[PDB]
Design a protein around this ligand. Structure first.
Ligand SMILES: [Zn+2]
Ligand SMILES: [Zn+2]
Ligand SMILES: [Zn+2]
Lengths: 96, 113, 62, 198, 34, 94, 285, 366
DNA sequence: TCTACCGATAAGCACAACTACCTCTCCT
RNA sequence: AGGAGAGGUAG
DNA sequence: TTGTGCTTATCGGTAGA
């Protein structure tokens, strides 16, 4: 970072990117046969239940292996963009 | 899978059928006591698949399969080829109709066939 | 103090080094000893703590 | 019943395709016969008897192969003895037997004992559902004659044992009706190779 | 190059109708150490 | 989930999954350091080191006898067995 | 190997219909997937109702929603149960002659009425003028596990079928290579009994749908037993493809001639021998 | 004392092979219900109340019914009289190496020595069966060998103790052999050999082969090591180490990975790399090992409000939490929170041993 | 109607569980 | 002079 | 302890004389 303000902006951007990646992983976890009624284009009143249950998604991911593979794949796909920020916040004289 | 204790000696009862009585009866071998049965129910078990206890977490039993993904279809809002397709019924329609869900993390669009 | 779970912030270290009269990033301008010309890029210098291991050269000669 | 009819239709089509590939002068009408035409020519019931036929080689009319379909599964020594007596009476040296279930060990020993006089080939009905030759993984197989085998051995100055080997139990060898001591030509999608049947 | 141990003494009585048993090595700065 | 189980039937096994927001420059949290140590403990094991050596030895014992002949064919040292009639290289020097 | 992974490719005539490949793959998955009877039934109970009929009739209650999701009917599952009872009939080594199953929308069961849209399946045991089946333990321990293990759909051999997408298949198509990325199905079958080949049982199960599965490119994923089905050359080609895939996954670059020489050296005697001492001894013998 | 749940294979036909509860006590294979009714229980309902499953599961009920049927078939009229005691006595006498004591005395000392009453041990057995059933149903988690909650470490008080015991036993054998050889045909100092134990200890300390905790033969290795004098740090870290013995070096399990139980006890960030990766764990700076307390804690527990265990098996517990001291059911408490708070307050006033763990869990209700 | 080898399952019984090097400490 | 038990280095 | 090959040993088995 050039100064402290740039460092704070980078920290906020990293936090928001991690939050977005976690949201993407949570969305990708729904691609199973159990949520076929919810993924269909119809009227479901349980839309808020899938969002408010934030602490259950991690527990469900840690128990299943296919869910874990899907989650890590989605996390890598969403974290490539986060890694791409180094060329924006990095100077040309950076040794790394 | 049901069990009860006769009020006489407080011991387990085994079900039996009598051709002459033509009714369900319970009598234990400890004492010569016979009592009438209730609801004519001798077995009632809820069917569950909890056979491999403490083993489904280590080995992936694949209880909930993942939905297939295709790349031939093309999304409308975005130009992404990867999408999830599955079959489900409608709100009031009959039969199975094909659905599609976009796999783009930034699109979030779903459409029917 | 350099407590592993109570490390001071990077800003504090930079301020401490700046108050000493040196660059806040730990790099100082150096000059080549062979030609005398000034190098274009500053070189980071610092008195780190090193150790000498028991493995020697003559102990491995066979 | 109709499922058995279409199963037998597929078996007959695959058998005719294999015979045409082996060069036994199979008519184009039998090769291009549709399912509806086969059913119409079948009648009410086949009884596993109308499939029995005799075919002769295209190059030589003396050589002929007779296809036998047993009436019931799990054939015994008596059925094999009747079949070989019929072959001796009809003066045929090759025959193809398509059975529903695996043969009796006594029947297998009887077949192996009389293999020197006449050559008998057994095929399961499940193996003839899909044509092995008509596949993208299987390359082109060409059977070399005695003169071509001698020319191949003389060109590279090698013996018959110093060649890549292929077992008789392989599906390709039984499809082409290859005996022990015959070489084949394989073209891969070009470099070619030869396999020795052992 | 000897063993730093201590002897064990316990009385044994025989009946009809302090002896030495063994030496245990002593850890340094133990309950019994100079 | 770190305290054995979350009580949602009692689980017995888990597949760890954690995201660390901090970096090495800022300073790792003790729980983050524990997570990193658990993740990186696999690379410090001595297992699976024998597999490449055993596989290489067993493949060498098979492919040692293969050599090219003066006639252009590929032959094995045992009995001059013909492995390949012609080398399948895509050029450029034979 | 017990998994015996298979590989089935779709035919070329399904592309004419709009979204034909997806519908065909879903139909094949629905037809060739094992669905146990226990996965559909929710509450199984035995009720004392009193060739003559025997007491201790069994009750199986199934919700209509489960049948709607699985696209099944009570008549269909009853017919499947009867067909599978008459197909093997090797178990149930007791005084049993016939087993008739009746379907009723509403049963005279006053024990519980929590579900109103659940259809009841009645199974009645028949005894040949004997009371050898009059006990409850025998039926509860033999017949109940037998019906729950009976699959209402698919075959007992097929374990699971998943739909996958690929761009570089092991068996390329002759023409039409412009199609970048096809859709195929991967089938896993049980290896409990080694008497019959898995491919042999798979060919018999796909008889009604022989036209849908493109048998010109379908091949087992295994290497050892593929030579017994399609010949040594097909096994060699699949082995070369798998070796190239493994090399690509390893990250290194290896020329083609090395892999071809390995394949030709490991299949010189007409069979793929193992890397152990027994394989080398057999190859030399 | 082992209670095993497995399919019955004795006097069982092909139709009946359901899971039953068996007891492996002194290698006798006694049915659980016979042992229940032998320990002062005369009713099936009382035995079921002792096993307070407090759940609705078909498998558990089927297993209990199968065990009852197996007990009924094994011994006829076992409920009436004392036929169960005779059956268990016969089973004990059927062993290859039966105890010298009778049946009336074997159940007091060889079966749950902590509980003096013959009916309290029946309640302890019922509690054990309840725990087993809860674990089988999935409500209770099973113990793991990687966690430090279920593991103990011994440095010198127990490692040298077993060596001293075995050397003393060998010396006693030699002494009695010499006495028998000399009596038929001397000071007491010549009878006892003073070199056997010293030579054995010297061999154990030199070769490093220590006696196996559970086997007479197959001496373990890696117990005694040499110090490093390259620098004081090496000799400081060599003294503070923890070793775990595994059957094979190629595979161990999950012990090679850190555990949340390592927080503040052993160092999870530093471990040797190689064959013993994770097996050798360095202790933390603030790490102490507890020692046995000579004071009696049972007398001080009743003063805080603990109520003694009920002797009669007919009286059930309503909401009284179980109090276990070193695996022994010492009594009951009305409220667990106030009880543990009072215990902690007493401990903080130097009225209790400073090395004592107080565990309160509402899931197990104990 | 009484014998032959013949299919799948239990139970021992084997080999194998990486190279290239360096020290010390204990026997025999 | 020869063997067994530990620790250590490099890929 | 495992992980696979490998050789005894027993359960039934259907077919032919
Ligand atoms: Zn009674
Ligand atoms: Zn889109
Ligand atoms: Zn009903």
């Amino acid at each position: 970072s050039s100064d402290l303000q740039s460092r704070k902006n980078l920290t906020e951007e990293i936090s928001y990117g991690l939050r977005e990646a976690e949201q993407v992983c949570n969305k990708q976890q729904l691609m199973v046969e159990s949520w076929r009624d919810f993924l269909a284009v119809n009227g479901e009143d349980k839309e808020e239940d899938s969002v408010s249950d934030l602490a259950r998604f991690c527990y469900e991911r840690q128990k299943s292996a296919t869910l874990s593979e899907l989650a890590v794949s989605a996390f890598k796909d969403a974290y490539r963009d986060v890694q791409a920020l180094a060329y924006r916040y990095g100077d040309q004289s950076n040794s790394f | 899978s049901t069990m009860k204790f006769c009020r006489e000696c407080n011991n387990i009862l085994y079900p039996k059928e009598d051709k002459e009585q033509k009714i369900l009866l319970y009598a234990c071998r400890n004492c010569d006591h016979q009592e009438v049965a209730d609801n004519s129910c001798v077995y009632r078990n809820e069917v569950h698949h909890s056979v491999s206890e403490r083993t489904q977490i280590l080995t992936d039993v694949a209880s909930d399969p993942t939905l297939p993904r295709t790349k031939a279809v093309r999304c409308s809002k975005c130009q992404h080829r990867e999408a999830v397709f599955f079959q489900a019924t409608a709100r009031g329609e009959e039969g199975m109709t094909l659905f599609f869900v976009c796999c783009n993390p930034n699109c979030g669009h779903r459409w029917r066939e | 103090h350099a407590t592993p779970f109570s490390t001071p912030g990077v800003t504090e270290i930079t301020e401490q080094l700046h108050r000493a009269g040196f660059s806040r990033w730990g790099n100082e301008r150096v000059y080549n000893g062979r030609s005398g010309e000034m190098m274009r890029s500053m070189i980071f210098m610092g008195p780190t703590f090193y150790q000498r291991l028991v493995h020697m050269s003559e102990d491995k000669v066979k | 019943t109709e499922e058995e009819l279409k199963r037998l239709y597929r078996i007959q089509k695959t058998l005719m395709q294999m015979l045409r590939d082996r060069g036994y002068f199979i008519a184009d009408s039998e090769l291009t016969m549709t399912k509806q035409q086969f059913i119409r020519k079948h009648g009410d019931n086949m009884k596993r008897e109308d499939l029995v036929t005799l075919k002769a080689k295209r190059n030589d009319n003396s050589d002929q192969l007779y296809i036998f379909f047993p009436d019931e599964a799990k054939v015994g020594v008596k059925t094999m003895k009747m079949y070989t007596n019929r072959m001796k009476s009809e003066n045929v040296f090759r025959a193809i037997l398509v059975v529903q279930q695996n043969l009796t060990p006594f029947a297998r020993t009887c077949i192996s004992e009389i293999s020197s006089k006449f050559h008998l080939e057994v095929f399961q009905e499940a193996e003839m559902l899909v044509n092995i030759k008509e596949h993208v993984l299987v390359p082109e197989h060409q059977v070399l004659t005695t003169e071509e085998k001698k020319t191949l051995l003389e060109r590279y100055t090698v013996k018959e044992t110093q060649l890549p080997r292929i077992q008789v139990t392989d599906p390709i060898a039984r499809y082409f009706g290859l005996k022990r001591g015959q070489v084949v030509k394989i073209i891969r999608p070009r470099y070619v190779t030869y396999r020795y049947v052992v | 190059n000897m063993t730093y141990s201590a002897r064990i003494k316990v009385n044994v009585q025989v009946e009809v109708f302090d002896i030495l048993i063994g030496s245990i090595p002593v850890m340094v700065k133990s309950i019994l150490c100079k | 989930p770190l305290r054995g189980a979350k009580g949602k039937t009692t689980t017995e096994s888990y597949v760890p999954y954690g995201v660390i927001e901090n970096s090495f420059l800022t300073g790792l949290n003790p729980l983050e350091s524990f997570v990193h140590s658990v993740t990186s403990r696999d690379s410090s094991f001595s297992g699976n080191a024998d597999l490449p050596g055993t596989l290489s030895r067993r493949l060498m014992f098979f492919m040692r006898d293969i050599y090219a002949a003066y006639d252009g064919t590929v032959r094995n040292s045992f009995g001059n067995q013909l492995v390949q009639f012609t080398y399948e290289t895509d050029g450029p020097v034979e | 190997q017990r998994e015996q992974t298979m590989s089935l490719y779709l035919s070329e005539y399904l592309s004419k219909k709009k979204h034909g490949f997806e519908y065909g793959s879903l139909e094949i998955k629905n037809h060739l997937e094992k669905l146990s009877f226990s996965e559909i039934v929710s509450t199984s109970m035995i009720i004392f109702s009193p060739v003559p009929l025997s007491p201790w009739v069994c009750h199986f209650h199934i919700s209509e929603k489960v049948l709607k999701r699985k696209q099944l009917s009570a008549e269909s599952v009853v017919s499947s149960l009867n067909e599978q009872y008459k197909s093997r009939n090797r178990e149930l080594k007791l005084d049993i002659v016939d087993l008739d199953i009746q379907n009723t929308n509403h049963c005279s069961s006053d024990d519980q009425a929590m579900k109103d849209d659940n259809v009841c399946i009645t199974v009645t045991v028949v005894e040949a003028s004997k009371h050898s089946v009059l006990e409850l333990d025998a039926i509860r321990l033999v017949l109940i596990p037998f019906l729950l293990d009976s699959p209402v759909k698919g075959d007992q051999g097929i374990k699971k079928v998943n739909i996958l997408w690929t761009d570089r298949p092991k068996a390329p198509k002759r023409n039409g290579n412009h199609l970048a990325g096809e859709l195929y199905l991967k089938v896993t079958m049980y290896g409990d009994r080694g008497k019959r080949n898995c491919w042999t049982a798979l060919l018999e199960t796909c008889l009604p749908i022989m036209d849908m599965i493109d048998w010109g490119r379908s091949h087992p994923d295994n290497i050892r037993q593929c030579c017994s089905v399609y010949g040594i050359d097909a096994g060699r080609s699949i082995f070369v493809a798998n070796l190239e895939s493994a090399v690509s996954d390893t990250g290194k670059e290896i020329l083609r001639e090395h892999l071809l020489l390995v394949a030709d050296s490991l299949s010189v005697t007409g069979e793929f021998v193992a890397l152990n001492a027994k394989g080398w001894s057999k190859q030399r013998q | 004392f082992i209670v095993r749940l497995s399919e019955n294979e004795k006097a069982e036909d092909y139709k009946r092979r359901e899971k039953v509860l068996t007891v492996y006590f002194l290698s006798t294979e006694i049915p659980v219900w016979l042992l229940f009714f032998a320990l002062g229980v005369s009713s099936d309902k009382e035995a079921m109340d002792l096993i307070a499953f407090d759940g609705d599961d078909a498998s558990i009920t089927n297993s209990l019914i199968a065990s009852i049927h197996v007990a009924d078939a094994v011994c006829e009229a076992f409920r009436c009289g004392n036929n169960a005691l005779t059956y268990v006595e016969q089973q004990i006498k059927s062993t290859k190496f039966p105890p010298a004591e009778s049946v009336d005395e074997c159940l007091h000392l060889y079966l749950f020595p902590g509980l003096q009453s013959l009916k309290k041990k029946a309640r302890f057995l019922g509690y054990m069966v309840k725990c087993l059933l809860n674990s089988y149903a999935g409500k209770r988690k099973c113990e793991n060998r990687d966690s430090f909650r279920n593991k103990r470490i011994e440095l010198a008080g127990e490692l040298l103790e077993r060596e001293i015991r075995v050397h003393l036993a060998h010396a006693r054998r030699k002494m009695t052999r010499a006495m028998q050889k000399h009596l038929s045909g001397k000071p007491i100092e010549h009878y006892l050999d003073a070199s056997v134990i010293t030579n054995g200890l010297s061999r154990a300390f030199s070769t490093g082969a220590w006696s196996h905790p559970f086997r007479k033969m197959e001496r373990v290795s890696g117990v005694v090591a040499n110090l490093g004098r390259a620098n004081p740090l090496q000799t400081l870290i060599d003294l503070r180490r923890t070793r775990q013995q595994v059957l094979y070096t190629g595979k161990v399990g999950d012990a090679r990975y850190p555990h949340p139980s390592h927080w503040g006890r052993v160092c999870f960030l530093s471990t040797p790399d190689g064959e013993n990766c994770g097996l050798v764990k360095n202790m933390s700076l603030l790490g102490l090992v507890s020692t046995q307390s000579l004071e009696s804690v049972v007398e001080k527990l009743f003063a805080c409000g603990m109520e003694e265990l009920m002797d009669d098996t007919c009286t059930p517990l309503f909401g009284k939490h179980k109090v276990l001291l070193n695996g022994d059911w010492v009594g009951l408490c009305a409220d667990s929170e106030s009880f543990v708070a009072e215990l902690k307050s007493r401990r903080r006033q130097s009225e209790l041993p400073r090395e004592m763990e107080i565990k309160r869990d509402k899931d197990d209700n104990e």
